[PDB]
Ligand binder design. Structure first.
Ligand SMILES: O[C@@H]1[C@@H](O)[C@H](O[C@@H]2CO[C@@H](O[C@@H]3CO[C@@H](O[C@@H]4CO[C@@H](O[C@@H]5CO[C@@H](O)[C@H](O)[C@H]5O)[C@H](O)[C@H]4O)[C@H](O)[C@H]3O)[C@H](O)[C@H]2O)OC[C@H]1O
Ligand SMILES: [Ca+2]
Ligand SMILES: [Ca+2]
Length: 167
């Protein structure tokens, strides 16, 4: 496969809680805003249930901030070509009913090219997919996943298998 993103399945990363948010996971930047007073737990988990490889990323939300992007996992770098249309696919599930996640892609200037907005995450693995086009002249973009929805308090959201593919 030819994918734009790096370590889309977390297989590069040792199992355990991630405390180095910026650099602890190859190909990703994790972020927690200061309005989140009970910070989430990001953990790379080795599990027989992983849809891809042996590992998944678990995001335990024990509270939230002011905006859903106050808890986020962003794939970076994402290597693309101007004008090209990509398919984004990822797998996600949650520990408990009722989770909400937005899957987004944008540039380093924070302009958003597209998203899946307030996706309904269930307790079973499901794929979430959309297309976007690089509408400007960027070659290195990013893919922010937003987890800080109030409905996720008391839940863990599991993601795996991010693939951003030409089309
Ligand atoms: O440390 C820094 C981080 O804080 C930083 O985080 C990034 C901040 O910028 C974020 O991008 C903004 C996200 O919000 C976008 O506006 C959205 C767009 O979507 C709107 O919802 C639409 C509703 O209707 C639907 O049909 C449609 O599908 C939806 O899109 C929603 O209402 C708006 O809030 C802004 O345009 C973005 O700029 C980015 O995600 C974060 O990663 O990152 C850098 C780091 O240094
Ligand atoms: Ca995996
Ligand atoms: Ca990083």
């Amino acid at each position: 496969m030819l994918v734009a993103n790096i370590n889309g399945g977390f297989e590069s990363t040792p199992a355990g809680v991630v405390t180095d948010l910026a650099e602890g996971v190859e190909g990703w930047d994790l972020n927690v805003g200061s309005s989140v007073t009970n910070p989430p737990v990001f953990e790379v988990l080795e599990t027989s249930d992983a849809p891809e490889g042996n590992k998944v990323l678990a995001v335990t939300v024990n509270g939230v901030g002011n905006n859903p992007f106050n808890i986020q996992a962003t794939a970076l770098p994402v290597n693309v070509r101007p004008g090209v249309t990509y398919t984004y696919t990822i797998r996600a599930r949650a520990e408990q009913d009722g989770a909400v996640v937005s899957f987004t892609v944008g540039n380093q200037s924070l302009d958003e090219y597209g998203r899946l907005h307030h996706q309904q995450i269930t307790t079973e693995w499901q794929p979430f997919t959309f297309e976007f086009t690089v509408s400007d002249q960027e070659t290195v973009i990013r893919a922010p996943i937003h987890f800080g929805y109030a409905a996720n308090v008391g839940n863990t959201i599991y993601i795996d298998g991010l693939a951003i593919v030409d089309l």
